[PDB]
UniProtKB/Swiss-Prot annotation:
Domain VWFA: 1-186
Subcellular location: Membrane
Protein name: Integrin alpha-1
Family according to the record: Belongs to the integrin alpha chain family.
Function of the protein: Integrin alpha-1/beta-1 is a receptor for laminin and collagen. It recognizes the proline-hydroxylated sequence G-F-P-G-E-R in collagen. Involved in anchorage-dependent, negative regulation of EGF-stimulated cell growth.
Complex and partners: Heterodimer of an alpha and a beta subunit. Alpha-1 associates with beta-1. Interacts with RAB21. Interacts (via cytoplasmic domain) with PTPN2; activates PTPN2 phosphatase activity towards EGFR and negatively regulates EGF signaling.
Residues of the full protein shown: 170 to 361 of 1179
Superkingdom of origin: Eukaryota
Domain notes: The integrin I-domain (insert) is a VWFA domain. Integrins with I-domains do not undergo protease cleavage.
Length: 187
């Protein structure tokens, strides 16, 4: 079984949001979701950090797909990637939100910029590592220094980086990595 938490940058720079929910749809529809199968929770970060839903909120794929479609962009003026990932680690992956004893933890992080809470990102990744959270990270290169941005997001991805890290040209391109992402998550 797998407990998957998808951690989405929902700040204003992310656009169009319908591409992000499309990526959610395409990704989730490759999964059997339920209490003895895969679970998904989703965290949105920006000016707030919000649990769109918990890991144990939904017991079928059909239910998750309907929920994901109603996730709206909550906005924000900065890239709060440290805060998002840490909130996911410390809160989404808890027993009270459906994390299952002994079940492997998996995080999928999607953003388009270098983080403004950059100082503490190394610490957050360090904690995730100690808690054996497998991390997939996705950098959206163009919005409607890229190098430092890319290397930051690469640095969130688990080893091997070549399997855990993705970059795409824009939000519309997120659906194009879903198949590979899905295969890799299930190893
Ligand atoms: Mg932003």
């Amino acid at each position: 079984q797998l407990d998957i938490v998808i951690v989405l940058d929902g700040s204003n720079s992310i656009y169009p949001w319908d591409s992000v929910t499309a990526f959610l749809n395409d990704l989730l529809e490759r999964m059997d979701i339920g209490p003895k199968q895969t679970q998904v929770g989703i965290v949105q970060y920006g000016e707030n950090v919000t649990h769109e839903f918990n890991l144990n909120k939904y017991s079928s794929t059909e239910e998750v797909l309907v929920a994901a479609k109603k996730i709206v962009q909550r906005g924000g003026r900065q890239t709060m990637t440290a805060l998002g990932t840490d909130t996911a680690r410390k809160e989404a992956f808890t027993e009270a939100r459906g994390a299952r004893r002994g079940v492997k933890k998996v995080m999928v992080i999607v953003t388009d910029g270098e983080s403004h809470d950059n100082h503490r990102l190394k610490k957050v990744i360090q904690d995730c590592e100690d808690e054996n959270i497998q991390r997939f990270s996705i950098a959206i290169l163009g919005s409607y220094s890229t190098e430092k941005f890319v290397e930051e997001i690469k640095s969130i991805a688990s080893e091997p980086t070549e399997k855990h890290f993705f970059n795409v040209s824009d939000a519309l391109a997120l659906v194009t990595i879903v198949k590979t992402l899905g295969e890799r998550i299930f190893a």
